[PDB]
Design a protein around this ligand. Structure first.
Ligand SMILES: Nc1ncnc2c1ncn2[C@@H]1O[C@H](COP(=O)(O)OP(=O)(O)OP(=O)(O)O)[C@@H](O)[C@H]1O
Ligand SMILES: Nc1ncnc2c1ncn2[C@@H]1O[C@H](COP(=O)(O)OP(=O)(O)OP(=O)(O)O)[C@@H](O)[C@H]1O
Ligand SMILES: Nc1ncnc2c1ncn2[C@@H]1O[C@H](COP(=O)(O)OP(=O)(O)OP(=O)(O)O)[C@@H](O)[C@H]1O
Ligand SMILES: Nc1ncnc2c1ncn2[C@@H]1O[C@H](COP(=O)(O)OP(=O)(O)OP(=O)(O)O)[C@@H](O)[C@H]1O
Ligand SMILES: Nc1ncnc2c1ncn2[C@@H]1O[C@H](COP(=O)(O)OP(=O)(O)OP(=O)(O)O)[C@@H](O)[C@H]1O
Ligand SMILES: Nc1ncnc2c1ncn2[C@@H]1O[C@H](COP(=O)(O)OP(=O)(O)O)[C@@H](O)[C@H]1O
Ligand SMILES: [Mg+2]
Ligand SMILES: [Mg+2]
Ligand SMILES: [Mg+2]
Ligand SMILES: [Mg+2]
Ligand SMILES: [Mg+2]
Lengths: 463, 456, 461
C-alpha cells in the first residue's frame, strides 16, 4: 500500500476533503457555473503555495487582464503585484484584444504550452493554474476534438511535473460535469463547485468527483467566501473524540444548579426549550452573567434582539450587561438570521470564539435560525456548532421553541447533553410557569416539574 | 481586505444594499431577465437617479424602442426625461432602432456603435452608460457563438472609457440559463438577474445578484415591486439588528390594560393582540390609535378586514370621532384589499405611508388578513419586515391576529412570529363574556390574571 | 405622472385587469395554444369598438375566410356581415389561396401593410386586428428575421396611428410565450391566453404579462367563453371580507340566531361544515325558507340532490318549496358538479343572480364541486362567488365537509362558520351544533345538542 504524494493546498477545509491535498504532477479540473468561486480557488491555490511553502507559480489567463486579476485579489489583502515584482508569481496573459479583433485561424495550444513551459522554467514554478480551458475550446467545438486537445495539454503538463489546477465552466447545476462532456474523462482529478438555488437562497458547495489513485471524502460539502477567500466546512472531518470531564459550572441560578445535580457539566451542551415568554432569554442572560461573575469570558449571540434591548431587559432583571462589557468579559453579537446563511453563522460563531476565547457561549434562539431552513441545513449547523464547542471545551447554552400552544423536530436533541424545559401552566384563571430538567447525561437531575416565578431579581424556582 | 473597490451608488431603493454600495466603477454590469421583468426600467432609473442626485450625466443606448417611447414610458413614474435631454444631462443614442425602409444587408458593425457611444460619453461628460437591447446585434452569427467575443470587446472598451455601464440582455425561462446564449455571464464582471416567477396563480418579481468580481454582495433573491416612483427592492437580509430601546411608556388607550402591562406599552415595542373574533380586537386598536391623536401624535390605521365606513361608524358608537382626527391631520386610515397585491406590496405600502406621514404609532387591524393563500415563509418575512422597520423608526406598533380564523386553529401564529413580538395580549371569551390577558410583556412585569376587557 | 391614454378594448373584465384597456396607438400581442379563444378576443376588440362606440375597424385574416369568421361570430349573435355592408367593419383577407400557389414561394409583408394602411384610411379605422400573424412568418426559420419583420410591422402601424391587436401562437401552456421566443421582446403589450389541462378538467386563464408604459393586474385571471363572448373574472379586485352594513338577518333557526349574537350579518358568507348526515342540507333549506317567509327572493343551488328530492325532503321538514316557486320567491337550480367547468358554475350563479335578483343564495354542498377539481381552482371559485355575493348585497350560505392552503384561505374569507357533527354518546347517536366563528360579533362558543324533526332543527340547552 504505497500512497501517492500530494501537494498540500491550504484552502481551509480543502485538505481534509482531498485528504492531504492535490496529487503531485497531476492535473485537477475544477468545474462550475458562473460565479461559483472557480477563479478564486485558482488564485488562492497559487497564493498560498507562494507564501506558505515558498513555491513559485504561474497563473495563465485567457479571459481577464492581469490588472483585474490583481485588483480583485487585493480585496482579500492578496497583494499579487508584490509577488509578481519579487519574481515569485507570474501571470501569463494569453487573453484576446479589442485591437486585432478577429483572426483567420483558431487558438494554438502548441504555442501556449511552449510559453507555459518557458514560464515554469524561468520562475522555477512548481505550482500552476489556468483560468479557463474553454476559452481555447470556444473553437474546436466538436467533442472529439476537445477530448484530444485537452489530453495533449494535460499530458504535456504532466511531463513538466508542475501540479496544475485548470478551470472549466458548466451551465447547469446537477447537470453535466463540464461543457462538451469530454473533459472530465481526461483529467485525473475532478472537483465540482456549485452554487445551488433553492427557494430564494443560494448555497455554495464543493465536491470531489474523483482523484485517480487516491482516496478522498466523497459527496457535497458546504463552503463560503470570507476574509481569506474560500473557507470550506467539511462537516464530518471533525472527530468524535472530544474530552469529557466531571468538572461543573454554575448555570447562574442556584436552585437550578441543585436540580441539575450540582450544576452543569463544563463540557456539556445545554438546550433550553419552551414556550415564548417562559424565560428562555432569562436563563441565557444569567448563564453569561455567571461566567463574568467568575471572571470568565462569554459570548452572547442574539438572533432576535438588538444589543440595546438586551441591555435594557438585563437591567430589569438586575444584570448590568454594560459593566460586564467594560471589563471585557461579556461580548454581545447581534444579527438577524436572514442576514446570512447558516454556514456563515457558523463561521461567525467560530471567528468570535477564536478572537475572544470564551469559556462559555450562548445562542439566544435556534428557532430564529431555523426560519425557512430545511432540516438538513439546520441540522448540519447545529452539529457543527456543538461539535466545535465541545472540541474547544466551551460550555454551550442554546435555546429553542416548544409547541405548547400549537398542535402537531427532536433530531438535535441527540446532540444535546442537558435539556431543560420551560412551560406555561394555567392555574385557576392565572398564567404561571414551570421548569424541569428533562435530560442530564452523566448526572442526577430532578424529575419534578416545579413552579417558578420571574421578577426583577431574575428567575426564582419554588418547591 | 486592503482593497476596497469604489462602487457607484445607483439609488435604486434597496439595490445599493444588495450590491452593498452600488455597481463597481468603470465596469460593466449585465442585467438579464424575461420580458416584463423591468430591465428597461432598471436601465433608465440608473441614469435618471445619477443625473438628479449626483449631477452625473449619462448616455442611454437603444436598440429596440425609440427615444419618444423611452420618454413617454418614463412619464408613468413622473420622470421628465425630455427636460434632461434639453439641458444636456441625458443623451439618448439610437444604436439600431431600425428604419422601416430597411436595406438588404446591415448590422454586423458593433465597432461603429462603440465609437459613437465613446463620442457621446466624451461630449456629455457621461459617467453612467446604460445599454438596452445589447442582444439585438447578437442575432447575427449566433450559431457561431461570436457573441462571447463581441461582448468581450464591447465590455473591454467600456472599461477603457471608464464609464460605469449597465447592459441588458434576454432570457426565455425564469429558472433556465442566465442569458440567451450561455456566454454572457462568463464575459461580464457583474451579473444581476431579474425574474418574474409564475407560481400557483400569481407572478412575483425578484432580484438577485450573482457573479460580482472583486467585491461582496448579498446572495439569493430579494422580492421587489414597481411603484409610481420606479423599482423598489426589499433586501430583508440587509436589515440590521441594531434597533434602539427605552423605558419610555405610551398609553394603550385602555386604563385597565395599562395597569396590566405594568404601566402601559413600551414606546419602541411591538404589540400583538391575538384572540377570537368578536372579542374586541378592533376596539383595542381604535383606542390605541385614538390615544396617539389625543396627545397630538400622528398615527396610521391600516385596515384589510373593514371598509372605511365601518371603521368610522363603529368608532362613533364608542365616542371616537375618527373623522375629526383626520381633519387635524393626526389620523390616517388606509384601507386596502389584502388580496389585490402580494405581501411585498403590502409591505411597500405600509412603508410608503409611514415615510410620508411620519407617525408615532401604527396599527394593523388583522395580520391574519394577509396570512392567507400564502406560505408561512412568505408571511413570516412580511411580519419581520414590518416589525423590524417599525422598531427601526421608533414607531409603536399594534398588530392583531385572529385565533379562530379557520378550523385548524392555534392560539399562536402558525409561522411563530411571537419571538419577534415584544408584548402579547390575548383576547378570549370567559364565564358569556369576554376577557383580556397579558401573555407576554418583554422588558417589564405584567399581570398574569385573566380579567374582563371592559374599556370603561 | 402622465398616464398613457387607453382604448377600452372592451371585453368583460379585461379592462379591469388592464386598468382601463389597451394603450392607444400601440400593438398588443395575444398569444396562446390552439383553442384558447384568440380569434374570439380579436373579434370582440373590433366588434365592441363598432357597436358600443363608433370606431370602425379592420380584421386581417390569414387562417380562415371572411365567410367563416362571420359564420362563427353569428353563434354569439354578432352580425358581422351587416357591419361590413355598412362600411364599419372591413375584413382584409390575407389568407393563402386554398387551391393555387405563388411562384415566389413566400410573401413580403410590405405588400400587406399598405393594404392594411389603405383599408384603415378608407374606413377611418381606429381598431385593427391581425389574426395569426404567425402564418406570415412560417416562411422564416430564423428568429432574427422574425424579429426584424415583426418590429417593422409594429413600427409601421404606429406611424399609421392605429391601435392594434395581433395574435400569435405557442405550443405549450407553461412554455415559451411565443413559439419563436422573440415576439414578446418586440411587442409593447403582451397578453397570454392558456387552456390548461389538469386532473381530468380544463381551465382557461388570461394574463397580462406586461404593458411597457403603464400598470396592470398581475397573475392568472380565469375566464370562460359564453354566448356573449369572453367573460373574465378579475378576482383580485373585489370585497371578500369587507361590508357596507351592520344589520342582521335571521338564519331561519331562532336559537341559532341567538348563538350568533343576533343572527347572521346581512351580506355575510356563512359556511356550515360537518360530517355526512349532520343536517347541512337542513340548514340550507331552512335558510331559503326564511328568506321567502319575509318575501325575499332566494336561489337554492344544488349538487347533491335533484329538484324532486329537495322538494320531498323539504316537505318532510315542513317546508313547501313548490309554493315558494309559485310565488316567484324561491328558485331551484340543480346540476351535477361534473356538468360544468368550475368557472361555469360561477358563471351560472352569477347569471341566475342577475336575472332573479335574490336577497340570498345557498349552496347545498361545496364539497360536491371540490371533489373533481384542483386545489387552486376551488379556492378561486369560492373567492369568485363570495366576491359577487357581497357586490350584490346577497347573504350566502354555503356548506362543506369536515393544514392545507386551500381550506385555510376559504375558511378565512368566510365570515361565519358553523360546525355540525354526528357522534356516538352512551351507545346512541347524537347531534351537535357549534358556532366556530362569527366575524365581528359576540357569539356563544359552546357546543349545543340538537335534534332534527319534521319541524326543522331544534337546538337544546
Ligand atoms: N472581499 C470579499 N468578501 C466577500 N465575498 C467576496 C469578496 N470578494 C469576492 N467575493 C465573492 O467571491 C466570488 C468570486 O467570484 P469568482 O472569481 O469565483 O467568479 P467566477 O465564478 O470564476 O466567474 P466565471 O463564472 O465567469 O468563471 C464573487 O462572486 C463574490 O461574491
Ligand atoms: N421586571 C420584571 N418583573 C416581572 N416580570 C418580568 C420582568 N421583566 C421581564 N419579566 C417577565 O419575564 C419574561 C421573559 O420572557 P422571555 O424573553 O423569556 O420570553 P421567551 O420565551 O424568550 O419568548 P421569545 O423567545 O419569543 O422572546 C417576560 O414574559 C416578562 O413577563
Ligand atoms: N406606474 C407603474 N406602476 C406599476 N407598474 C408599472 C408602472 N409603469 C410600468 N409598470 C410595469 O413595469 C413593467 C415595465 O418594465 P419593462 O417591461 O420596461 O422591462 P422590459 O421592457 O420587460 O424589458 P423588455 O424591454 O425586454 O421587455 C411593465 O410590464 C409594467 O408592469
Ligand atoms: N358560441 C360559443 N359558445 C361557447 N363556446 C364557444 C362558442 N364559440 C366558440 N367557442 C369555443 O371557442 C373555442 C375556439 O376559440 P377561438 O376560435 O377564439 O380560438 P382559435 O383562435 O380558433 O384558436 P386556434 O387558432 O388554436 O384554433 C372552441 O374550442 C369553442 O369551444
Ligand atoms: N322527517 C325526518 N325526521 C327525522 N329526521 C330526519 C327527517 N328527515 C331527515 N332526517 C335526518 O336528517 C339527516 C340528513 O340531514 P340533511 O338532509 O338536512 O343534510 P345531510 O343529509 O346531513 O347532508 P349530507 O347528505 O350531504 O350529509 C338524516 O341523517 C336524517 O336522519
Ligand atoms: N363593548 C364592547 N366591549 C368589548 N368588545 C366589543 C364591544 N363592542 C363590540 N366589541 C367587539 O370589538 C370587535 C372589533 O372587531 P374584531 O373583534 O376585531 O372582529 P374580528 O376579530 O373578527 O376582526 C367587534 O367585532 C365587536 O364584537
Ligand atoms: Mg472566473
Ligand atoms: Mg426570548
Ligand atoms: Mg376586527
Ligand atoms: Mg384562430
Ligand atoms: Mg347534504
Amino acid at each position: 500500500h504505497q500512497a501517492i504524494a500530494k501537494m498540500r493546498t491550504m484552502i481551509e477545509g480543502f485538505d481534509d476533503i482531498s485528504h492531504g491535498g492535490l496529487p503531485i504532477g497531476r492535473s485537477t479540473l475544477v468545474s462550475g457555473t458562473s460565479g461559483t468561486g472557480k477563479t478564486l480557488f485558482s488564485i488562492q491555490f497559487l497564493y498560498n503555495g507562494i507564501i506558505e511553502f515558498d513555491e513559485p507559480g504561474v497563473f495563465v489567463t485567457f479571459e481577464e487582464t492581469p490588472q483585474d486579476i490583481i485588483k480583485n485579489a487585493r480585496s482579500f489583502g492578496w497583494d499579487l503585484a508584490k509577488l509578481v515584482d519579487e519574481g515569485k508569481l507570474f501571470i501569463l496573459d494569453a487573453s484576446p484584444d479589442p485591437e486585432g479583433q478577429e483572426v483567420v485561424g483558431g487558438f494554438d495550444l502548441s504555442a501556449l504550452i511552449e510559453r507555459i513551459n518557458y514560464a515554469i522554467q524561468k520562475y522555477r514554478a512548481r505550482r500552476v493554474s489556468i483560468d479557463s480551458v474553454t476559452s481555447v475550446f470556444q473553437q474546436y467545438d466538436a467533442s472529439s476534438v476537445v477530448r484530444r486537445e485537452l489530453f495533449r495539454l494535460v499530458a504535456r503538463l504532466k511531463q513538466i511535473g508542475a501540479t496544475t489546477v485548470m478551470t472549466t465552466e458548466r451551465i447547469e447545476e446537477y447537470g453535466p460535469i463540464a461543457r462538451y462532456g469530454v473533459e472530465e474523462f481526461v483529467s485525473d482529478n475532478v472537483v465540482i463547485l456549485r452554487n445551488v438555488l433553492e427557494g430564494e437562497r443560494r448555497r455554495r458547495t464543493l465536491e470531489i468527483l474523483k482523484l485517480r489513485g487516491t482516496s478522498h471524502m466523497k459527496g457535497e460539502y458546504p463552503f463560503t467566501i470570507t476574509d481569506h477567500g474560500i473557507n470550506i466546512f467539511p462537516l464530518g472531518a471533525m472527530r468524535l473524540t472530544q474530552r469529557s470531564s466531571n468538572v461543573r459550572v454554575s448555570s447562574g441560578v442556584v436552585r437550578l444548579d441543585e436540580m441539575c445535580g450540582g450544576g452543569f457539566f463544563k463540557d456539556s451542551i445545554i438546550l433550553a426549550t419552551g414556550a415564548t415568554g417562559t424565560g428562555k432569554t432569562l436563563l441565557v442572560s444569567r448563564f453569561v452573567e455567571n461566567a463574568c461573575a467568575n471572571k470568565e469570558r462569554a459570548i452572547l449571540f442574539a438572533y432576535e434582539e438588538s444589543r440595546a434591548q438586551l441591555l435594557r431587559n438585563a437591567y430589569s432583571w438586575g444584570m448590568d450587561f454594560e459593566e460586564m462589557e467594560r471589563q471585557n468579559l461579556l461580548k454581545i453579537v447581534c444579527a438577524y438570521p436572514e442576514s446570512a446563511g447558516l454556514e456563515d453563522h457558523l463561521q461567525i460563531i467560530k471567528s468570535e470564539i477564536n478572537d475572544f476565547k470564551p469559556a462559555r457561549i450562548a445562542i439566544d434562539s435556534l428557532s430564529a435560525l431555523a426560519r425557512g431552513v430545511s432540516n438538513n441545513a439546520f441540522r448540519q449547523f447545529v452539529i457543527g456548532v456543538t461539535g466545535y464547542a465541545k472540541q474547544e471545551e466551551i460550555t454551550g447554552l442554546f435555546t429553542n421553541t416548544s409547541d405548547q400552544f400549537m398542535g402537531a423536530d427532536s433530531h438535535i436533541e441527540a446532540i444535546t447533553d442537558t435539556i431543560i424545559l420551560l412551560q406555561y401552566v394555567e392555574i385557576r384563571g392565572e398564567m404561571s410557569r414551570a421548569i424541569n430538567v428533562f435530560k442530564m447525561r452523566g448526572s442526577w437531575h430532578d424529575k419534578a416539574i416545579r413552579e417558578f416565578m420571574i421578577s426583577d431579581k431574575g428567575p426564582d424556582i419554588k418547591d
